[PDB]
Symmetry: C3
Subunit: 143 residues, 3 copies
């Protein structure tokens, strides 16, 4: 499976990119003193710090959007890598996803004007939709 | 692995079903003018459209519930497909999950009376619980 | 792959642990009469029970944090199991994750003082970060 190393490289970079979002979220909570739990707020200055914050909420939305998109790619890309795609075509699917997703997180956390985030989201979903349909046909025909 | 094509067909349909929920959510935000981000609200009419909406919130709950259930199935069903189950028994596990999950999303977004959604949820979790236990025993015995 | 049974045992226990969190959340909603949907509230006593609750919110945060961490482990641990790690070293990665994650959920739902939850979270992420980097290098070198 000549496409497998490319898949594993892109996927693992995206997982690390999600870990970076978790790290950023934690740092933002600490810096803004905005905690979700009274036990956390009390350790960090008092009950008034058990509160929501727009920058924390933004981080959580970026992380959730990652879960909505990167997790399915992990499944789809892995299966697709084993079904014998042209390696260059596979590379292009994986690269468009990687670049689109990294750009999405930059656009989201960086508060870039619309529709920059929505374009990057849509661009990244294209190779996912492609892989899903290709897998669907391969599965269907082996039933 | 005679169960693998059936697994891949059901799983990929469920992923596409999750993409449809993402699409619906976006359309609902646009139609109700209810955006989570000031950059989005400003592109679409002004800051007063940076607001929550019950139909948007409902879409997000359906999508989150999908992530809580479909993602584990993707892992469990894949592993289970390789452990040599009777193919018909495997088919039944996958079909009950697929039908239960599609019904769950229809019940959720369609605002069907309780306990229709909760029944479909519980029904779909049954084959997941079954596969998890079967995998647990197979793993345990190879330790 | 001598590490595979250990991976599948730990992963499947963690999935079951996530199902337990879903079950607890449902029980808490019912016990506190705090539902997210008017159709649910109406079946269970009236519209005033369509409301948020801190214990329900806490359960949802624990479940979300599981999705943020356990799902990537399912991918990373599976790939890592096939790359020929020393089986004892692999066992240690999987065990630290399993124990850290179970402890995280106990700390979260049990409202244990800070920084108990954050320590368990960080400890569990260590083997995940390790596996991710090891996979990154293996993938990179096969490009
Ligand atoms: N969505 C989470 C993200 C941060 C988080 O999960 N925090 C922990 C407390 S630990 C402290 C921390 O912020 C943190 C963040 C990232 C990492 C890390 C990650 C990957 C590799 C290496 C290190 C280590 C520690 C928690 O239990 N949150 C409760 C919850 O999720 O509801 C949040 O809003 O709190
Ligand atoms: N839970 C999300 C769902 C929609 C979404 O993710 N929107 C993007 C902006 S893109 C516009 C769009 O709505 C959209 C939706 C689906 C698709 C699509 C999907 C699959 C295949 C093909 C096409 C393409 C575009 C975002 O960054 N949201 C910010 C966030 O998640 O916090 C939300 O509530 O916004
Ligand atoms: N995060 C969810 C967790 C509970 C849930 O998903 N509830 C269903 C209604 S079903 C009743 C139930 O609570 C329940 C919970 C767990 C299980 C179960 C799980 C695994 C194995 C075996 C059994 C079976 C039933 C729902 O549609 N919630 C709407 C939503 O997620 O927005 C919530 O806050 O409601
Ligand atoms: C590699 C580790 C870097 C992670 C950076 C996050 C640092 C901030 O972590 C903070 O720790 C507190 C401990 O009580 C928690 O209560 C807070 O919720 C959390 O934001
Ligand atoms: C296949 C593509 C169909 C997706 C339908 C979603 C269309 C609505 O997408 C909208 O785009 C805006 C761009 O600025 C965003 O700000 C909004 O959040 C989003 O709802
Ligand atoms: C194995 C099954 C045990 C799951 C325990 C959860 C029981 C509570 O489930 C309740 O069912 C109601 C039905 O209308 C829903 O409206 C509530 O949201 C849900 O909390
Ligand atoms: C992983 C990728 C991390 C993305 C970096 C975040 C970009 C923030 C841009 C500068 C801070 C402005 C804020 O808002
Ligand atoms: C994917 C499956 C999509 C589910 C379709 C949504 C059903 C909505 C029912 C009709 C609109 C009523 C609302 O509420
Ligand atoms: C799965 C692991 C389930 C974790 C059990 C929850 C611990 C709750 C501790 C006792 C109730 C106190 C509350 O708060």
């Amino acid at each position: 499976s000549p496409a497998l190393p490319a898949f594993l490289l892109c996927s693992t970079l995206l997982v690390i990119k999600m870990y970076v979002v978790a790290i950023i979220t934690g740092q933002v909570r600490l810096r803004k003193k905005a905690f979700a739990n009274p036990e956390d707020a009390l350790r960090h200055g008092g009950p008034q710090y058990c509160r929501s914050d727009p920058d924390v909420e933004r981080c959580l939305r970026a992380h959730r959007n990652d879960m909505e998109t990167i997790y399915p790619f992990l499944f789809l890309g892995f299966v697709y890598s084993f079904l014998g795609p042209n390696p260059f075509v596979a590379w292009m699917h994986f690269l468009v996803f990687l670049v689109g997703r990294v750009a999405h997180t930059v656009a989201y956390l960086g508060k870039l004007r619309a529709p920059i985030r929505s374009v990057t989201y849509t661009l990244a979903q294209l190779p996912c939709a492609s892989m899903a349909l290709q897998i669907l046909w391969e599965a269907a025909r082996h039933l």
